[PDB]
Amino acid sequence: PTPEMREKLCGHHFVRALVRVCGGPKW
Amino acid sequence: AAATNPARYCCLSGCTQQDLLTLCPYG
Numbered sequence: 001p002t003p004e005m006r007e008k009l010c011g012h013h014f015v016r017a018l019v020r021v022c023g024g025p026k027w
Numbered sequence: 028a029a030a031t032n033p034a035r036y037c038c039l040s041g042c043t044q045q046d047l048l049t050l051c052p053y054g
Contacts, residue, residue, distance in 0.1 A: 027054075
């Protein structure tokens with residue numbers, strides 16, 4: 001089912017996976 | 028995508044780099 005991986009990004013897990021792909025200055 | 032709250036959704040079911048990509052470069 002697609003070459004992706006829906007990580008169960010919970011709370012900080014998400015904000016982290018976040019700072020990874022878009023790398024924002026906020027967080 | 029387009030189901031429930033951001034992080035809340037990415038926490039329960041999951042979220043790939045893309046589903047994350049659509050939630051990182053904003054805040």
